[PDB]
């Protein structure tokens, strides 16, 4: 209750190191941002290209989560298709500036609600993104807690078209236990931190549903997803 086991301590460092890695390979070029009906379509292209970059980083990181590739390739597909948008929203929260309410997607470029809006996105999606990003910052996760939460989110036996739920729920346990032990130790007086974090998985699930509706609303608007995103989100 005062210290992690070496197996757990190891597990956490590998995830944290894996995430750091996948984010460096992410550094190593998209449609610029327009400073018009073409400009309207270009901002969207811009967003979609940032989204492609995110997906790649996410797949890369999931491949480095121990046990992920020991799963059926098909279940790999299933878990990622469900996971990707939720993990994106977690990483968006991680780039949120609460003082000015914008998200930094590159290095010094900041995006505001109006910026999201000028890219064809609707406010009913936009505001829930900022709302969640805001709530996330209240929680103030560190590297270890982010990395575990993402591991846990990936291994949700809940997802559509998962063939072996039991395998998936078995992989998730050690990561859930690690998060549980980790928070008791780092924050012994806050008995609810573990629960609050799980609660965020609930929020993300609704947010996923809001995003689908955004994707659908883009069809009726002549905007289609690029191939990778389409592969992931279209129906």
């Amino acid at each position: 209750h005062m210290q992690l086991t070496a197996a757990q301590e190891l597990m956490i460092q590998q995830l944290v190191a894996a995430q750091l890695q996948c984010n460096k390979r992410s550094f190593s070029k998209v449609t610029p941002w327009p400073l018009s009906r073409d400009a309207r379509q270009q901002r969207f292209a811009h967003f979609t290209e940032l989204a492609i970059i995110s997906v790649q980083e996410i797949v890369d990181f999931a491949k480095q989560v121990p046990g992920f590739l020991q799963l059926g390739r098909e279940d790999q597909i299933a878990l990622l298709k469900a996971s990707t948008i939720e993990i994106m929203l977690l990483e968006t929260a991680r780039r949120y500036n609460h003082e000015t309410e914008c998200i930094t997607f590159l290095k010094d470029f900041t995006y505001s609600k109006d910026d999201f809006h000028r890219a064809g996105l609707q406010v009913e999606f936009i505001n829930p993104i900022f709302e969640f990003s805001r709530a996330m910052r209240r929680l103030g996760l560190d590297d270890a807690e982010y990395a575990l939460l993402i591991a846990i989110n990936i291994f949700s036996a809940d997802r559509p078209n998962v063939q072996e739920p039991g395998r998936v729920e078995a992989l998730q346990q050690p990561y859930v236990e690690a998060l549980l032990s980790y928070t008791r130790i780092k924050r012994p007086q806050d008995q609810l931190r573990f629960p609050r974090m799980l609660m965020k998985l609930v929020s993300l699930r609704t947010l996923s549903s809001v995003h689908s509706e955004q994707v659908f609303a883009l069809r009726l608007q002549d905007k289609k997803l690029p191939p990778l995103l389409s592969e992931i989100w279209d129906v």
Binding site: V59, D60, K63, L69, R73, I77, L80, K81, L228, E231
Partner: peptide, 12 residues
């Protein structure tokens, strides 16, 4: 099905 994704998973 899921071609570009199947790629990303296969790399390396």
């Amino acid at each position: 099905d899921h071609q570009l994704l199947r790629y990303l998973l296969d790399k390396d």
